[PDB]
Design a protein around this ligand. Sequence first.
Ligand SMILES: O=C(O)[C@H]1[C@H]2CC[C@H](CC2)[C@@H]1Nc1nc(-c2c[nH]c3ncc(F)cc23)ncc1F
Length: 158
Amino acid sequence: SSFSFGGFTFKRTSGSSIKREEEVLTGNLQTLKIRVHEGYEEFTMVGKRATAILRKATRRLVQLIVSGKDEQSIAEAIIVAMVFSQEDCMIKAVRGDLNFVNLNPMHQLLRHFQKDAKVLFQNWGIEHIDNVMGMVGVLPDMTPSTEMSMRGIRVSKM
Ligand SMILES: O=C(O)[C@H]1[C@H]2CC[C@H](CC2)[C@@H]1Nc1nc(-c2c[nH]c3ncc(F)cc23)ncc1F
C-alpha cells in the first residue's frame, strides 16, 4: 500500500480513507477538481534527503515531524506534506498573476509551491510550541525557533 509523490515514498501506518471527487477554490477564485481523501491517516514519508511522520485528517494536516539533510531538503518535504494534506490554506495560497492551473491537479499544486513556497508557508499560519528537546519549530523563512513554528510542523534531528 505504498505510493510515490514529490520524490517521497509514502507508506500508510494507521487509519483509512475513501475518495471523493470534489471542487476546491484557489486564492485566484479558480475551480479545481481534486480527489479528496476522507478520514484520519498516518503516513511515513521516505525520501533520499528527508524522512517525515505525517499525521493527517480530511483536508487537514494534524502533525508533521520532519528530519533531513539541511533546510532545503526539509522545506522540500514540508511542501509535499502541505500539498498532500489537501488543506484549504494551501489551495488558497495559489494566488496572483500567471499563477493558474491547466491530468492530475495535485502534481500541478506541487510544481507551483516548489517554484515558490513563500505565500504557502506565510499563509499556512504560525503556532506557539510547548518546549521539547530534539524537536524544534520552524518559521515560514525556514529559521529554527524554540518559541514558534508553522502550524503542526516540527523539525527533528537526524
Ligand atoms: O490521488 C492521486 O491521484 C494520487 C496522486 C496525488 C497524490 C498521491 C500520489 C499521486 C495520490 N495517490 C494515492 N493517494 C493515497 C492517499 C491516501 N490518503 C491521502 N490523502 C491525501 C492525498 F492527496 C492522497 C492520499 N493513497 C494511495 C495513492 F496511490
